[PDB]
Design a protein around this ligand. Structure first.
Ligand SMILES: CCN(CC)CCC[C@@H](C)Nc1c2ccc(Cl)cc2nc2ccc(OC)cc12
Ligand SMILES: Nc1ncnc2c1ncn2[C@@H]1O[C@H](CSCC[C@H](N)C(=O)O)[C@@H](O)[C@H]1O
Length: 280
């Protein structure tokens, strides 16, 4: 329950969705410019679609490119809370008339296992996995599987933090000191591009600057600041349980240019995102 609420707090204190919106406005149109060619139905598969904000922006661009074409947007999302929010959002929208939504409460692995419980693999015209590969156990198998589901002229979009983000510096230096867990992998676009290269898949990668306002993290007692610390360290009650020296060290590094930039009296952690477009 806190994972989702924690992520929402992060979104509320970062330009993440704004960054993605910038990408969807500037780059997506060209990227999805042919996924619907010759088709009377466009199938979009959203893996880890969460609350649906980005999914809906993606859909608006596809609808704009293919007016009148029915769009089937299927979502693989294991969080009931996320699905509920997603449905709430859709229920408020009226400018997505050619779209049919379907929500499957399951992980991508369960989805994968099941689709493989049939005779024919279902093909898709656009598949996206936005900010969710960190929670997949077997990334190479996941990448290979979903790529295999791409139909003609289809594309797969994956988004994760960039190897040049502050996350990369944080994980490399403090990674081992943080609570390790297969449930969450510390991967960046560098890890993903290497896996894609080894898989022999063709792709294009675009990096976009994004920031996480961690100003409150330097205000002791600050509720938001403390919850963001938990987020950054993926440790519940970090300031209340972490070693006084580790906390002191982190507080210092998170202020360095390698991790953040200081402007307008605020500390902006480098949240540069990588948008990877994989070809069928
Ligand atoms: C760039 C940072 N990003 C990727 C590592 C992760 C932020 C993770 C935060 C939100 N916590 C999360 C987790 C933390 C620890 C472990 Cl063991 C498993 C986790 N699973 C999560 C699944 C969904 C989620 O979205 C609703 C957030 C999660
Ligand atoms: N194994 C898995 N397969 C599919 N989705 C998963 C998953 N593990 C976690 N998720 C989902 O991955 C999402 C990560 S946060 C997603 C945010 C959304 N794509 C957007 O960018 O705003 C959450 O909604 C979470 O429940």
């Amino acid at each position: 329950g806190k994972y989702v609420e924690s992520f929402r707090r992060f979104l509320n204190h970062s330009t993440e969705h704004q960054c993605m919106q910038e990408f969807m406005d500037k780059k997506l149109p060209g990227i999805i410019g042919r996924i619907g060619d010759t088709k009377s139905e466009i199938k979009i598969l959203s893996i880890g679609g969460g609350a649906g904000e980005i999914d809906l922006q993606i859909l608006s661009k596809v609808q704009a490119q293919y007016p009148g074409v029915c769009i089937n947007n299927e979502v693989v999302e294991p969080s009931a809370e996320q699905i509920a929010k997603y449905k709430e959002l859709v229920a408020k929208i009226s400018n997505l008339e050619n779209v049919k939504f379907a929500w499957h409460k399951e992980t991508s692995s369960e989805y994968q296992s099941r689709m493989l419980e049939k005779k024919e693999l279902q093909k898709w015209d656009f598949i996206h996995m936005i900010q969710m590969l960190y929670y997949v156990k077997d990334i190479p198998a996941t990448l290979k599987f979903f790529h295999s589901l791409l139909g003609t002229n289809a594309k797969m979009l994956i988004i994760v933090v960039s190897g040049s983000s502050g996350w990369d510096k944080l994980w490399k230096k403090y990674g081992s000191r943080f609570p390790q867990d297969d449930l969450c992998q510390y991967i960046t676009s560098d890890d993903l591009t290497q896996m894609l290269d080894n898989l022999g898949l063709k792709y294009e990668c675009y990096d976009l600057l994004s920031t996480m306002d961690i100003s409150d993290c330097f205000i002791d007692g600050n509720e938001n600041g403390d919850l963001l610390w938990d987020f950054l360290t993926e440790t519940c009650n970090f300031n209340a349980t972490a070693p006084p020296d580790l906390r002191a060290e982190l507080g210092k590094d998170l202020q360095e240019p390698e991790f953040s930039a200081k402007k307008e009296g605020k500390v902006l952690f480098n949240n540069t995102l990588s948008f990877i477009v994989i070809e069928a």
